[PDB]
Automatic annotation (TrEMBL), chains A, B:
It comes from Adeno-associated virus 9 (AAV9). Ca(2+) 1 binds at residues 343, 346. Belongs to the parvoviridae capsid protein family. The chain holds residues 220 to 736 of 736 of the full protein. The lineage of its organism: Viruses, Monodnaviria, Shotokuvirae, Cossaviricota, Quintoviricetes. The keyword Transferase does not apply. This is Capsid protein VP1.
């Protein structure tokens, strides 16, 4: 009915043993996109570009619901609870509701704007439960539910890309009509809901290692293996020899080991002290990249690698880490104090440093003549016996990604962080049903071009159940914990200021507790 | 439904033996507060102040329902019945209803204001039943239900304070988002209700003592105890002696007693005959106060003490009594004839006078040389064997307060009067759901800033069941009763005037019947 509410405001968190259930409700507004039309888009329509930036695709009159960020579900305090008390977590169940739909019509006279209710208009909503549409979630896009529950947000417009040759299309390109799906139609008084079960995924590692991969031995006992220690008796000619020694606590670098650090793809090193950087432009020319069909793409963020060495936190890889913007930061050429650079220093115990060579390999045969020659390894692929950690997740970062439907993949954990699934939470698509203005009184076969100006508003609720993996550490000394600082300040961190603006002052990871290797 | 009422007007009182049930219904209006925003506030945002007045906190877009005053429930005649016939009363049950919701939208053109119904808008309401929010009830604030049932009232805005250092915040400060609670959403056609059981509390003493604590003896019989009556035989040197006498009806001041008057904290004395006061400014400098973290707060009203001696009703303690304003009284520097000063003269039989010393103590050892020296006690804490009465309640005064959640407290009766509870009636919070105006037709990630101007109106009902404690006195002569005066006047007391304004001409306490000690 018109006078009865279709749902209530549900927003809290329940901590139930080894489960936590988060619930979020937000207020959304949806405009009419594209004047109800499907439009072909390309870099031709955007004004042209280089070959690396060419594309072809379509924008649709539909919008979509995205909640693929952790702050859509966790408050900062709840995130603190989770990361300070658990070794792991993963999503299990999802429930989604859309309710209290209101459709408004806008009339603009010469000098006045009037907004009225349209009680008989509809919104169309459907889920892509069979994964038949291009999946644009999982590209770290704007338009998710806002972190602050009081913020009213605008629903982003749906569009997609297909195969391109420059700004042109090939015969293999696909065009999708979203009206060619069955969808539910809602007047003011109807609601929509659905449930979803997550795939079985591994727990995320919300811990750091308290041991290093090269320091796993007993520091008191020798090995029963020998290593070559000398090849010449001394100075002079014809001094060749072979001497062997026991590998022990005095020489840990030469001990035999069972496991080796994971793969690498070297990045350029950039200092936040700008005077230490080379006085030249190297953002694009000095960057690591990969090529596909003649197009170059930045290797960003790339394989999970440690950001810097010990004591070198002023250095960061060129495109090897996630960079978030601070509240109120612009979009073009902002200074370093306006952005937030994450660092994966916790994985330095298993993962190679991002701005270093993996190691050295022999490159010749020494003989009595050529000396022994070695070469640097700048990119090392997977080898048997390698171990590594994945990239951390953040309160501001993405949760899941869709694994591409391919013949083969390896370790399909998404490179920007999170859970990779073949059947992720489905896309939820929404659109205001077009309402024509007065048609002519003589028949015309052309499609109608005049429409009543409308938009819609409502409430959306998402509830996720997460499974937790508790710590049972035997460590004696206290752990490192995420904490607020007592020292006085003008504002409270993770709160509003005097003007009403909510901000997140820093990125928060998940790795504070410790575990052995 | 839109065309059906959600509740009826219920407003009366039922006297049922040892119970009385009061019911009140009022009409309320709720605006949009803060433009739907949370704002940080401080004395910095208020313009600065002294150290004693610094604060830090937040204002919210929510309003709240308060009925923590006796005239919200009792008519003057019902109050007369209660206080003239009972030794005690206390609250037992509460029922709360919110109904007949109407949401209106306001459109302001160049020179005209139009108000229309918005049939599809919602109000959000919830109770803080777990006491998780700062409890701002119990600070004697404006914004309660009006005494006169025909008055339409405006719902006050919710705000709270947290820890401050000057105008700055510390890391211990808490920020609360009220959208982070589950709440019920109501369209025009929905209603809300809940029930609450009061904690077990002692009966309020609606009586005065007909005996004095120093006059509890039989005036005809001697004691079997002696007191020292003489220490010198007479005039001259070396006349020391020890003489003892029986304490009896001729010397009542020296009799042994089992119980002593309650505690004290001396106040400065102010005369309503201004020419008797000192010709200087002493409102702040001469006031009693307590210190907390370097901040001074007025001791107001402080411990329950008798206002004045016999025959000195022109004197009142500086900040030791509740002062109410008369109808139409301003807020800054009004004259004494514009305010109503209560007096706790009924408790002079057990409680010390507010503007006097508690007594005298010895301060040395007399010997044969030093004479006997005594000193005044200006503040006396609790001693075993002390008895006292609490502050009276008034028809205009507060009913209950929340006892702070602390390790320890003593006699947690609220100092401004009433019933102290660990789980008082919960706070009831209400807000108009924001309705965005027309959003742009291109996606923007910023939160929406343009909203439709709305407000809401409705009916609220509160029903309280109170338990009574009847008198079974054996007193022969008639009691003192609260009564109206027959003498003619321009208006009727506790009624409206020719312009429609209701007024309460005087404060009415509860202590008219008498009881023995």
């Amino acid at each position: 009915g018109v006078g009865s509410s279709s749902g209530n405001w549900h927003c809290d968190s329940q901590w139930l043993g080894d489960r936590v259930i988060t619930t979020s409700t937000r207020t959304w507004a949806l405009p009419t996109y594209n004047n109800h039309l499907y439009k072909q888009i390309s870099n031709s329509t955007s004004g042209g570009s280089s070959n690396d930036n060419a594309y072809f695709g379509y924008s649709t009159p539909w919008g979509y619901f995205d909640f693929n960020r952790f702050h859509c579900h966790f408050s900062p305090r709840d995130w603190q609870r989770l990361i300070n008390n658990n070794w792991g977590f993963r999503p299990k169940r999802l429930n989604f509701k859309l309710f209290n739909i209101q459709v408004k019509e806008v009339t603009d006279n010469n000098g006045v704007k009037t907004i009225a209710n349209n009680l008989t208009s509809t919104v169309q909503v459907f889920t892509d439960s069979d994964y038949q549409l291009p999946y644009v979630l999982g590209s770290a896009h704007e338009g998710c539910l806002p972190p602050f529950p009081a913020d009213v947000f605008m629903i982003p417009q749906y569009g997609y890309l297909t195969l391109n040759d420059g700004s042109q299309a090939v015969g293999r390109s696909s065009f999708y009509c979203l009206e060619y799906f069955p969808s539910q139609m809602l007047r003011t008084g109807n609601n929509f809901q659905f449930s979803y079960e997550f795939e079985n995924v591994p727990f995320h590692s919300s811990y750091a290692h308290s041991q290093s991969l090269d320091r796993l031995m007993n520091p008191l006992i020798d090995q029963y293996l020998y290593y070559l220690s000398k090849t010449i008796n001394g100075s002079g000619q014809n001094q060749q020899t072979l001497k062997f020694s026991v590998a022990g606590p005095s020489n840990m670098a030469v001990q035999g080991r069972n496991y080796i650090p994971g793969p690498s793809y070297r990045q350029q090193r950039v200092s936040t002290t700008v005077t230490q950087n080379n006085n030249s432009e190297f953002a694009w020319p000095g960057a690591s990249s990969w090529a596909l069909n003649g197009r170059n793409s930045l290797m960003n963020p790339g394989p999970a690698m440690a950001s810097h060495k010990e004591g070198e936190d002023r250095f960061f890889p060129l495109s090897g880490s996630l960079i978030f913007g601070k509240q109120g930061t612009g979009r073009d050429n902002v200074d370093a104090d306006k952005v937030m650079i994450t660092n994966e220093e916790e994985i330095k115990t298993t993962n190679p440093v991002a701005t270093e060579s993996y190691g050295q390999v022999a490159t010749n045969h020494q003989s009595a003549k050529a000396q022994a020659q070695t070469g640097w390894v700048q990119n090392q692929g997977i080898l048997p016996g390698m171990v590594w950690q994945d990239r951390d997740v953040y309160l501001q970062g993405p949760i899941w990604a869709k694994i591409p439907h391919t013949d083969g993949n390896f370790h399909p954990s998404p490179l920007m962080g999170g859970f990779g699934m073949k059947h992720p939470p489905p896309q939820i698509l929404i659109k205001n049903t077009p309402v024509p203005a007065d048609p002519p009184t003589a028949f015309n076969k052309d499609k109608l071009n005049s429409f009543i100006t409308q938009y819609s508003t409502g409430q959306v609720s998402v509830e996720i159940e997460w499974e937790l993996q508790k710590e049972n550490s035997k460590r004696w000394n206290p752990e490192i914990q995420y904490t607020s600082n007592y020292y006085k300040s003008n504002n409270v961190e993770f709160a509003v200021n005097t003007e009403g603006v909510y901000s997140e002052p820093r990125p928060i990871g998940t790795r504070y507790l410790t575990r052995n290797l």
